[PDB]
Amino acid sequence: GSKKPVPIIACNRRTGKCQRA
Amino acid sequence: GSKKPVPIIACNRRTGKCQRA
């Protein structure tokens, strides 16, 4: 999670964290 | 878009699609 290459975010199966694209 | 290995979904940067984990 640093820049916003896309509007819609996306989460992942780790510990509860998402990001852009 | 077939199996849900995780509750929180994630939208990829393509054309407006998401998935689980």
* Cβ atoms of residues B19 and B10 within 8 Å: yes
* C-alpha distance from B2 to closest chain A C-alpha (Å): 16
Q: Cα(A21)–Cα(B18) distance, rounded to whole angstroms?
A: 10
Cβ within 8 Å, pair B11-A16: no
Give the method used.
NMR
Please name the residues in contact with B7: beta carbons below 8 A apart, sequence gap of 6 or more: B20
> Quick one: closest CA in A to B4, which residue?
A13
Q: How many CB atoms lie within 10 A of CB B3?
A: 8
Q: Cα(A4)–Cα(A14) distance, rounded to whole angstroms?
A: 20
Contact status of A1 with chain B (Cβ, < 8 Å):
no
